[PDB]
Amino acid sequence: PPSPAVVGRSLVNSFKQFVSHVDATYRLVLDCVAAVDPLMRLYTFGSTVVYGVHEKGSDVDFVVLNKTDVEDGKGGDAATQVAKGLQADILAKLARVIRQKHLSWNVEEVRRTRVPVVRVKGGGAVDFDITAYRRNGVRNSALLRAYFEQNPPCRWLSMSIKRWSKQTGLNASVIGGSITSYGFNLMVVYYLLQRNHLQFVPPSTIDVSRVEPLPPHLPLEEPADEGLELGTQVLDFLHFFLHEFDSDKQVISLNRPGITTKEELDWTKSAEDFARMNGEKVHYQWCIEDPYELNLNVGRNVTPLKRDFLRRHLEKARDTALLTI
Ligand SMILES: O=c1ccn([C@@H]2O[C@H](COP(=O)(O)OP(=O)(O)OP(=O)(O)O)[C@@H](O)[C@H]2O)c(=O)[nH]1
Ligand SMILES: [Mg+2]
Ligand SMILES: [Mg+2]
Numbered sequence: 001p002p003s004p005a006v007v008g009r010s011l012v013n014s015f016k017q018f019v020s021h022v023d024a025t026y027r028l029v030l031d032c033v034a035a036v037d038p039l040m041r042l043y044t045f046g047s048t049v050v051y052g053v054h055e056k057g058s059d060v061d062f063v064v065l066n067k068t069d070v071e072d073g074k075g076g077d078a079a080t081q082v083a084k085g086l087q088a089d090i091l092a093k094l095a096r097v098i099r100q101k102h103l104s105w106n107v108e109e110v111r112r113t114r115v116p117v118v119r120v121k122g123g124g125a126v127d128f129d130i131t132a133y134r135r136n137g138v139r140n141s142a143l144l145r146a147y148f149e150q151n152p153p154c155r156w157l158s159m160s161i162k163r164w165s166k167q168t169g170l171n172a173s174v175i176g177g178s179i180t181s182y183g184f185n186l187m188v189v190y191y192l193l194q195r196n197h198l199q200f201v202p203p204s205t206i207d208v209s210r211v212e213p214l215p216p217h218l219p220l221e222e223p224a225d226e227g228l229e230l231g232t233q234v235l236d237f238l239h240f241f242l243h244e245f246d247s248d249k250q251v252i253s254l255n256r257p258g259i260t261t262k263e264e265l266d267w268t269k270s271a272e273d274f275a276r277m278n279g280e281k282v283h284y285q286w287c288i289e290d291p292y293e294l295n296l297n298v299g300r301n302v303t304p305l306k307r308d309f310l311r312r313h314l315e316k317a318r319d320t321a322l323l324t325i
Contacts, residue, residue, distance in 0.1 A: 004235055007321040008227025011160060011234070014324050019222055022054060025128070026214055029062055035097045036090070041065050043213045045141040050148065050185065051155055052218025060128040063137060064090070073209035076292070077134045079114075087116045087132045094118065094130065114278065136292045139206050140182075143254070143291065145215070146206075147189050150198050155220065157233050158188045164322040168313050178306040183288050183298045190252045191240050200257045203291040231321070238318045247307070252299075253289040262287060267297065286310065 022044070030042050046061030048054050077083075092109065095118050099107050105122040118130045131137070148155050162181050165171040172180045192198045223230060245252075251260040251267065262268060267284040275282040277300060285307045288298035302310070317323070 002319065002321060002325070004231035005226070005228055006231070007234055007324075008223075008225075008229070008231030010227075010321045010324040011156075011230055012223060012227040015156075018056065019220070022048060022060065022214065025060060025126070029128070029130070032094060032097045032101060033064060035101070036094050039067070041067070041070065041213065043138055044215070045137045047181070049141045049215050050144040051159070052145070052148075052215070053220055055159075061137065062128055062130045063134060064094070064130065064132045065135075066133075069133060069135065070209055072135075073207040074204070075135065076294075077136050079294070083133065084116055087134075090132050091116055091118050091130065094132075112278070135208050138208055138211060139203075140291055142206050142208075142211050143201065143203060144185055144189065146201060147192075147198055149218070151192075152218065153221070153223070153229070154188075154192060154197070154233075156223070156230055157237070158185060160230075160234065160322055161188060161237075164317065167323050170310065170313060172301070176306075178302045178310075179286075179288075179299060186254065186288055186298065187241070187252055188237075189254060191237055193254070193257070194240070195236075203255060234322065235318055238314055242311070242314050247286055251287040251289050254291050255289060260289065265289070 026042065026044065033040050033042050041064070043063050043065055044060065045063065047058055048060060054060075088109075088111070095107050095109055098105065098118075098120065102122070105120060105126070108119045108121075110117045110119060115131060115134070120126070120128050120130065148158070161184055162171075165177075165179070165181070165184055166173060169176050170179060171177045171184075189198070193200065249261060251262055251265060253260040262284065265287075267287055269284070272281065272284060282297060282300040283302055284297065285304055286299040286302040290296040290298055319325075
């Protein structure tokens with residue numbers, strides 16, 4: 001039964017190597033974007049914006065927007081087939097230009113998903129996704145960024161979890177995973193919110209017309225107490241999601257302070273039968289409400305099996321210090 005101090009020491013010891021550049025990539029992509037249309041604008045989001053630092057082994061998330069798209073700072077994103085058609089068409093042209101200017105890059109066009117996207121991979125340190133005509137990503141990324149700016153050190157915690165989620169197979173980037181890194185960020189912020197270590201921020205206050213396309217960098221300071229606070233936070237987090245959060249009644253949400261119940265959202269078993277996403281079906285075993293999308297559960301792919309798995313890994317994590325001992 002390790003103490004918080006031992007867990008902390010292990011974690012800080014595990015990050016020593018990392019504690020020792022996007023402009024060029026941004027310009028490179030902007031060149032192609034301009035080649036398609038000089039009036040289109042390029043915006044950055046993802047972990048680069050949420051943390052304010054770029055982690056080795058992480059991609060970059062880009063979106064293309066028009067003037068009218070930016071001016072409608074608080075509008076929603078449509079879910080119709082027509083919108084996916086326009087998005088697919090412009091992304092096709094852009095992909096064409098990209099392949100023309102870089103022959104060694106691999107450019108994939110992704111279809112049969114809720115959000116069309118172009119995925120670009122290149123040898124070494126070049127990996128990014130590109131979307132079009134959507135604001136929700138930039139918005140929730142800005143929200144998370146603000147939350148973490150309230151309390152910078154907490155970033156460490158989040159980082160750890162993310163890494164852990166990819167080492168255990170929980171992250172949707174691995175065969176068998178069910179929850180994306182975005183969902184884990186939502187969980188971390190929710191936990192921090194219930195413990196009154198942060199103050200609530202209404203999602204409707206974020207304005208896309210007032211954000212930087214490439215926000216500045218945020219320095220990361222190593223812990224000075226050798227990791228005591230970090231270990232305490234990790235253990236308390238695991239305890240909270242093991243014995244305090246009731247997955248049969250409650251919903252992880254940043255839309256409200258306090259508790260949100262499944263009943264008031266009609267996320268019940270009667271609802272599972274009628275629901276049908278992308279032709280598949282949605283689950284309400286591990287519920288994560290999205291702050292901007294309409295009636296979307298971010299844990300829609302968590303089956304009872306993946307639920308059990310999640311519980312088991314949460315239990316094992318407290319003794320191995322997130323697989324560091
Ligand atoms: O379901 C989703 C998933 C993702 N997103 C949007 O995509 C952005 C990045 O989605 P990622 O899953 O890549 O998370 P991340 O970048 O923070 O961490 P890495 O795994 O890449 O290391 C998120 O910040 C969110 O704005 C959504 O809006 N909805
Ligand atoms: Mg990413
Ligand atoms: Mg991603």
